[PDB]
């Protein structure tokens, strides 16, 4: 369902600048924006498992 | 709220164990308050006494206990625990003197008491002996020393100390008082102590219900001020 | 923790303090719970005297039998 | 809160009907004063004493309060 | 119903109490440790709650022997005990082999004694995390040990409040090699990112471990290093 | 109102209030502000400014461009004093202060309170001196945030004033205590001796005696007696004059009252 | 029991927002605290496309908030608000509003028609010290 | 600095540009004089055209401002004074007093010309309401200006 997200996000990047093109950089930046996660920055929770 | 650790000594979520706080606020059922101050050659402790009946004797109520020839102590909180605590302290001082050959400084004695309480609360099955500790003593090349021990194994020494029920007000008053200038003269210390207690309790003091104790470089021996001399001090400060 | 019950408590509580000050009628309230205190506050003249009842004492049982 | 008698079709008032025809008969028995005697009660002597103080004397001695300047419960 | 005890497993994964201990650790005062090409620098914050408390009574940076320094984060009273333990462990080793103990050995023995307290119910684990610095065999060493029992090595790190921002800024700033003074400067400035208020010479404790030993800096050099620079 | 057959709108009728809210309107002009009470002079000074000054010249704080300040939050132990203070200050100026009852009940009261207060504030607009006193409190948080957000947010109300009374420290609610709505916090405390003396003498006012009374000893003997407690000791001395069919209260009746009432206080201290 | 009721409410919301019967020309706004614990059924695009942060103010943001709030006020002083801007104290906007309101009220209380800035530091210490001393041992 | 000037060229947000300019000035504090001074001028300009000119004099009295007092700050002060008085001739003469100071730098003269034209528009519209037919030399005498440029301006108006 997030392939639609990639496409729409590249579209909005194009729209914000008042353009009708779509280039590859727009797609890449949409890729980075849609894919987002986080991890345990504590570094102690990770290390107790060997 | 909720009580993960309300019953015993284990860690709650957010890492705050709840028995020691109950021990801390168990200090107020004594219903007293004491203050301690330090001047360049003097150390002063002041506290009040409550005698609710005349059948009570007068020499069997004092909370001022002698630790050793140069070290004195004052107590708060409940009573029996204080007596156990001072018994332990006397034992520690005697052992130190016998083992090492010279005199115990106040620092090491305070650390010994703190370590005792810490080990006491690390394990289970022992109630953490809820009383606060304040000691004064004179030593060389440091002068007057005042220190206080905490039922959770904390200890620190500092210029103006208050404990009991009205610490939040007495400490603030002392903060306002001390900022202008240092209490250089001997009698300014007694001035500040009496004024602090009078203002925080909003009442002046009849001499028979106040206990004070001072130590000075002139004579490191612990001494308790008698009635006549406190009369003189009060009428001098209260013209 | 029912719409009748608030209205009935209102009726009681208002008529409680609407009594003639001369006061020749009397009121006796004998409940076994003091489990809640919202209804009919016991202070400020809304209510007056209280009585406690003990559980039977030593003489109580012998006397009753 | 007055009771009233009303015409069926027009709801105009016709009579006030102040005659007591309220609620249902309960507690309104004149058959007997109750029959318990204080001798039937064990132990609660202090409670009956306080109760007599709180009710029985006001019910007869209101004037003692009035001339003392106090209001009974 | 899989909490309040350390002798049983959760229905799915791992023990419960140790996570709470680590959470209690993360709530303490901040501190930072930086390795240099020829020395180690530890810095920590010392905050008073008044003007009555005397800064000269209790220290935070502590020496173990002539060449090993120790700093901590977490709660207070549980710190003196294992410091004293480390002291006597080092002394026993010196008696046995007549030579100062290498840092790794002390770290692992401390880890063992610190893990001893987790098994069995009736003892609560230590709620303190340690950082250890030493110079041995021509090389500096820096180590971290946790309440669980594990230990591991850093190039430069920080812990306490807002440790996420500290890690980000250190990865943002730290290069590979410098001298001690540069490390001191960067440590001071990197802890500026917290501690609401001005930094007087009495609210910061800085210790160094150089080739000739471990030494804590006098307040004169501290105010000098923070004066008119950083 | 609709016609009987053609169903046309002949007239509109006014709308009233649900019960309990209807009941809770009462007033007492007898107690003069800061006067007919016992004599709580320490807290007397603070109360007047916060309330009277906004309404006497709101244009000043509109000169500085600040939202209207509000009445103070009252904090006490027995709950007796707060009521008298509000009634007294209402009596000085307010025509009919409308007070509402507060208690701890769990859920579904958001609308029950919201439309209640909206319409009551309309009623307060009806006569300008109206003061909307709120009684001591102690699901919840919904009603708390709803009240704060709405009543002060759509407020726009030119002359109506607010006072809130609560005992003990309750659940966290800074947004209620933030400046401009509950800025001023007061801490009533237990009755000093010398104010107690005036209070008990005022209660003794109607009680008959022959001047033998030693009030100073009575004061020295017992403490902790709030105004209700003093009313109790005076009543019990009256009862001890009723004992043995006496007429004029004697000092020993006051002694017996002190003894018994202080015992019933110590007993069942709950 | 009664946990399933909560889960059923969530399922109904998900079904209603992107289900069999599509509706057009409707929108949805959602606001909560930190969103690490949200159910990933909500967060997939096509259902909650945009995710937006509202972080704590920094120096520039605080400068703007102070200028905007004060411009409405009758301050009229030869004093610099930026002295309070440069303070490194972490703070939120609601507190900025509270500071300004208390300073104005404190000025008017003593019957001074205009703020005199001997009270900005007063209110600033008033709200900054909004802290409680923890028990010493936690430290 | 450049973020501020770009937000300025948009000619729609004359308040955030003030923020970026002030931050840029604070950054240049006592370490880069030639840039700090020009940041000061741009800051004051941003203050001028939001129609709060007295704040210019309020700002130049600041603690950091006294260090960097010079000639250009006087030019900005007098421009603010003339704009407050709405005197067109005073504005022109004030510009004449300062030629190398603010007349001939980029991103300064442009906004000044814009403000000048807007002010002249307001003055012309203020003195037409009573009349339904009036000769123009009388209008020039009232406005204290020539006749040719008045004709040109009115023609551009009515196009």
UniProtKB/Swiss-Prot annotation, chain A:
Record-annotated disulphide pairs: none
Source superkingdom: Eukaryota
Subcellular location per the Swiss-Prot or TrEMBL entry: Cytoplasm; Nucleus
Signal sequence coordinates: none
Role according to the record: Component of the 26S proteasome, a multiprotein complex involved in the ATP-dependent degradation of ubiquitinated proteins. This complex plays a key role in the maintenance of protein homeostasis by removing misfolded or damaged proteins, which could impair cellular functions, and by removing proteins whose functions are no longer required. Therefore, the proteasome participates in numerous cellular processes, including cell cycle progression, apoptosis, or DNA damage repair.
Entry similarity comment: Belongs to the AAA ATPase family.
Subunit-structure text: Component of the 19S proteasome regulatory particle complex. The 26S proteasome consists of a 20S core particle (CP) and two 19S regulatory subunits (RP). The regulatory particle is made of a lid composed of 9 subunits, a base containing 6 ATPases including PSMC5 and few additional components. Component of a complex with USP49 and RUVBL1. Interacts with PRPF19. Interacts with TRIM5. Interacts with NDC80. Interacts with PAAF1. Interacts, in vitro, with the thyroid hormone receptor (in a thyroid hormone T3-dependent manner) and with retinoid X receptor (RXR). Interacts with ERCC6.
Protein name as catalogued: 26S proteasome regulatory subunit 8
Source species: Homo sapiens (Human)
Parent-protein residues present: 357 to 406 of 406
UniProtKB/Swiss-Prot annotation, chain B:
Coiled-coil region(s): none
SUPFAM superfamilies: N-terminal nucleophile aminohydrolases (Ntn hydrolases)
Compartment annotation: Cytoplasm; Nucleus
Keyword annotations of the record: Acetylation, Cytoplasm, Glycoprotein, Nucleus, Phosphoprotein, Proteasome
Residues recorded with modification Phosphoserine: 12, 58-59
N6-acetyllysine sites (modified residues): 97, 99
Recorded superkingdom: Eukaryota
A Gene Ontology BP annotation from the UniProt entry: regulation of inflammatory response
Alphabetical list of CDD domains matching this protein: proteasome_alpha_type_6 (cd03754)
Gene Ontology CC, one term: extracellular exosome
Family membership: Belongs to the peptidase T1A family.
Role description: Component of the 20S core proteasome complex involved in the proteolytic degradation of most intracellular proteins. This complex plays numerous essential roles within the cell by associating with different regulatory particles. Associated with two 19S regulatory particles, forms the 26S proteasome and thus participates in the ATP-dependent degradation of ubiquitinated proteins.
This protein's name: Proteasome subunit alpha type-6
Naturally occurring in which organism (per UniProt): Homo sapiens (Human)
Gene it is expressed from: PSMA6
From Swiss-Prot, chain D:
Protein family (similarity comment): Belongs to the AAA ATPase family.
Function: Component of the 26S proteasome, a multiprotein complex involved in the ATP-dependent degradation of ubiquitinated proteins. This complex plays a key role in the maintenance of protein homeostasis by removing misfolded or damaged proteins, which could impair cellular functions, and by removing proteins whose functions are no longer required. Therefore, the proteasome participates in numerous cellular processes, including cell cycle progression, apoptosis, or DNA damage repair.
Encoding gene (name): PSMC3
Protein name from the UniProt record: 26S proteasome regulatory subunit 6A
Subunit structure, interactors included: Component of the 19S proteasome regulatory particle complex. The 26S proteasome consists of a 20S core particle (CP) and two 19S regulatory subunits (RP). The regulatory particle is made of a lid composed of 9 subunits, a base containing 6 ATPases including PSMC3 and few additional components. Interacts with PAAF1.
Recorded superkingdom: Eukaryota
Annotated disorder: Deafness, cataract, impaired intellectual development, and polyneuropathy: An autosomal recessive disease characterized by early onset of deafness, cataract, severe developmental delay, and severely impaired intellectual development. Patients later develop polyneuropathy of the lower extremities, associated with depigmentation of the hair in that area.
Species of provenance: Homo sapiens
UniProtKB/Swiss-Prot annotation, chain H:
Residues of the full protein shown: 212 to 370 of 422
Superkingdom, taxonomy of origin: Eukaryota
Subunit structure comment from the entry: Component of the 19S proteasome regulatory particle complex. The 26S proteasome consists of a 20S core particle (CP) and two 19S regulatory subunits (RP). The regulatory particle is made of a lid composed of 9 subunits including PSMD11, a base containing 6 ATPases and few additional components.
Reported impact of residue 61 to A: Does not affect phosphorylation by AMPK
Crosslinked positions (Glycyl lysine isopeptide (Lys-Gly) (interchain with G-Cter in SUMO2)): 63
Protein's recorded name: 26S proteasome non-ATPase regulatory subunit 11
Entry similarity comment: Belongs to the proteasome subunit S9 family.
Induction notes from the record: By FOXO4; expression in embryonic stem cells (ESCs) is mediated by FOXO4.
UniProt domain PCI: residue ranges: 13-159
Tissue specificity of this protein: Highly expressed in embryonic stem cells (ESCs). Expression decreases as ESCs differentiate.
């Amino acid at each position: 369902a997030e392939v639609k997200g990639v496409c729409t996000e590249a579209g909005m990047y194009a729209l914000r600048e008042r353009r009708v093109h779509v280039t590859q950089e727009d797609f890449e930046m949409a890729v980075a924006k849609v894919m987002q996660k986080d991890s345990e920055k504590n570094m102690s929770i990770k290390k107790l498992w060997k | 709220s909720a009580g993960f650790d309300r019953h015993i000594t284990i860690f709650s979520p957010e890492g705050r164990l709840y028995q020691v706080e109950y021990a801390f606020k168990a200090i107020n059922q004594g219903g007293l308050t004491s203050v301690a101050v330090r001047g360049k050659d003097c150390a002063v402790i002041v506290t009040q006494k409550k005698v609710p009946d005349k059948l009570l004797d007068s020499s069997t109520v004092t909370h001022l206990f002698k630790i050793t020839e140069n070290i004195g102590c004052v107590m708060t909180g409940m009573t029996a625990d204080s007596r156990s605590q001072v018994q332990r302290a006397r034992y520690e001082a005697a052992n130190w003197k016998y083992k090492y050959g010279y005199e115990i400084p106040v620092d090491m004695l305070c650390k010994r008491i703190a370590d005792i309480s810490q080990v006491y609360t690390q394990n289970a099955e022992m109630r953490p002996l809820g009383c606060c500790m304040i000691l004064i003593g004179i030593d060389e090349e440091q002068g007057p020393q005042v220190y206080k021990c905490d039922p959770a194994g904390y200890y620190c020494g500092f210029k103006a100390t208050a404990a009991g029920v009205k610490q939040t007000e007495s400490t603030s008053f002392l903060e306002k008082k001390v900022k202008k200038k240092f209490d250089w003269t001997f009698e300014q210390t007694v001035e500040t102590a009496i004024t602090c207690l009078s203002t925080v309790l909003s009442i002046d003091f009849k001499p028979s219900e106040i206990e004070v104790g001072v130590v000075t470089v002139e004579n490191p021996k612990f001494r308790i001020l008698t009635e006549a001399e406190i009369d003189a001090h009060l009428v001098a400060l209260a013209e | 923790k029912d719409r009748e019950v608030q209205r009935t408590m209102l009726e009681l509580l208002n008529q409680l303090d609407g009594f003639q000050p001369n006061t020749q009628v009397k009121v006796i309230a004998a409940t076994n719970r003091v489990d809640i205190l919202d209804p009919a506050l016991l202070r400020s003249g809304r209510l007056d005297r209280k009585i406690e009842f003990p559980m039977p004492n030593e003489e109580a049982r012998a006397r009753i039998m | 809160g007055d009771l009233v008698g009303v015409n069926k079709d027009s709801y105009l008032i016709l009579e006030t009907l102040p005659t007591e025809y309220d609620s249902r008969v309960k507690a309104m028995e004149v058959d007997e004063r109750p029959t318990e005697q204080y001798s039937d009660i064990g132990g609660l002597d202090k409670q009956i004493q306080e109760l007599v103080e709180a009710i029985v004397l006001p019910m007869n001695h209101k004037e003692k309060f009035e001339n003392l300047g106090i209001q009974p419960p | 119903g899989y909490s309040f005890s350390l002798t049983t497993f959760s229905p799915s994964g791992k023990l419960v109490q140790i996570e709470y201990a680590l959470a209690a650790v993360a709530g303490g005062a901040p501190s930072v440790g930086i390795k240099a090409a020829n020395g180690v620098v530890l810095a920590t914050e010392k905050k008073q709650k008044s003007i009555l408390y005397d800064e000269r009574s209790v220290h935070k940076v502590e020496p173990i022997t002539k060449h090993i320094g120790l700093v901590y984060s977490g709660m207070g009273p549980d710190y003196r005990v294992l410091v004293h333990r480390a002291r006597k462990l080092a002394q026993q080793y010196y008696l046995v082999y007549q030579e100062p103990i290498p840092t790794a050995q002390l770290v692992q023995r401390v880890a063992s004694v610190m893990q001893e307290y987790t098994q069995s119910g009736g003892v609560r684990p230590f709620g303190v995390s340690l950082l250890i610095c030493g110079w041995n065999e021509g090389r500096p060493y820096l180590f971290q040990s946790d309440p669980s029992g594990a230990y591991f090595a850093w190039k430069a790190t920080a812990m306490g409040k807002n440790y996420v921002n500290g890690k980000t800024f250190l990865e943002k700033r730290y290069n590979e090699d410098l001298e001690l003074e540069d490390a001191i400067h960067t440590a001071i400035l990197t802890l500026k990112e917290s501690f609401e208020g001005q930094m007087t010479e009495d609210n910061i404790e800085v210790g160094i471990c150089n080739e000739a030993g471990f030494r804590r800096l006098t307040p004169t050099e501290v105010k000098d290093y923070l004066a008119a620079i950083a | 109102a609709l016609d009987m057959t053609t169903l046309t709108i002949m007239r509109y009728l006014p709308r009233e209030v649900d019960p309990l809210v209807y009941n809770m309107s009462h007033e007492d002009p007898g107690n003069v502000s800061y006067s007919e009470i016992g004599g709580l002079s320490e807290q007397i000074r603070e109360l007047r400014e916060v309330i009277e000054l906004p309404l006497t010249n709101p244009e000043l704080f509109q000169r500085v461009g600040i939202i209207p300040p509000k009445g103070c939050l009252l904090y006490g132990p027995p709950g007796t004093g707060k009521t008298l203070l509000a009634r007294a200050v209402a009596s000085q100026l307010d025509c009919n202060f409308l007070k509402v009852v507060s208690s701890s009940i769990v859920d579904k009261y958001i609308g029950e309170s919201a439309r209640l207060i909206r319409e009551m504030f309309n009623y307060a607009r009806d006569h300008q001196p109206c003061i909307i006193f709120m009684d001591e409190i102690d699901e919840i948080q919904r009603t708390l945030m709803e009240l704060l957000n709405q009543m002060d947010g759509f407020d726009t109300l030119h002359r109506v004033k607010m006072i809130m009374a609560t005992n003990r420290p309750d659940t966290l609610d800074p947004a209620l205590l933030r400046p401009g709505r509950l800025d001023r916090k007061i801490h009533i405390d237990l009755p000093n001796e010398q104010a107690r003396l005036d209070i008990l003498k005022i209660h003794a006012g109607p009680i008959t005696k022959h001047g033998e009374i030693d009030y100073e000893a009575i004061v020295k003997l017992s403490d902790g007696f709030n105004g209700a407690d003093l009313r109790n000791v005076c009543t019990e001395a009256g009862m001890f004059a009723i004992r043995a069919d006496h007429d004029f209260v004697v000092q020993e009746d006051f002694m017996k009252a002190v003894r018994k009432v202080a015992d019933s206080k110590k007993l069942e201290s709950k | 029991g009664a946990d399933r009721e909560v889960q059923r409410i969530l399922l109904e919301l998900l079904n209603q927002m992107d289900g069999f019967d599509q509706n057009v020309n409707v929108k949805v706004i959602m606001a909560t605290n930190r969103a690490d614990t949200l159910d990933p059924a909500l967060l997939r695009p096509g259902r909650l496309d945009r995710k937006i942060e509202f972080p704590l103010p920094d120096r520039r943001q605080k400068r703007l908030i102070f200028s905007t709030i004060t411009s409405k006020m009758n301050l009229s002083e030869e004093v610099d608000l930026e002295d309070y801007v440069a303070r490194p104290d972490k703070i939120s906007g609601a507190d900025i509003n509270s500071i300004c309101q208390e300073s104005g009220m404190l000025a008017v209380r003593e019957n001074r028609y205009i703020v005199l800035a001997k009270d900005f530091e007063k209110a600033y210490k008033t709200v900054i010290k909004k802290d409680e001393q923890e028990h010493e041992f936690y430290k | 600095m450049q973020s501020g000037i770009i937000h300025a060229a948009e000619e729609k947000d004359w308040k955030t540009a003030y923020s970026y300019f002030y931050e840029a000035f604070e950054g240049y504090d006592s370490i880069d004089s030639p840039k700090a001074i020009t940041s000061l001028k741009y800051m004051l300009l941003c203050k001028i055209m939001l129609n709060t000119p007295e704040d210019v004099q309020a700002l130049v009295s600041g603690k950091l401002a006294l260090r960097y007092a010079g000639r250009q700050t006087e030019a900005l002060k007098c421009v603010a004074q003339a704009s407050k008085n709405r005197s067109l001739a005073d504005f022109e003469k004030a510009l004449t007093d300062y030629r190398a100071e603010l007349r001939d730098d980029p991103i300064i003269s442009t906004h000044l010309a814009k403000l000048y034209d807007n002010l002249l528009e307001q003055n012309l519209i203020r003195v037409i309401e009573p009349f339904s037919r009036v000769q123009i030399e009388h209008i020039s005498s009232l406005i204290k200006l020539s006749k040719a440029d008045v004709e040109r301006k009115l023609s551009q108006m009515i196009l």
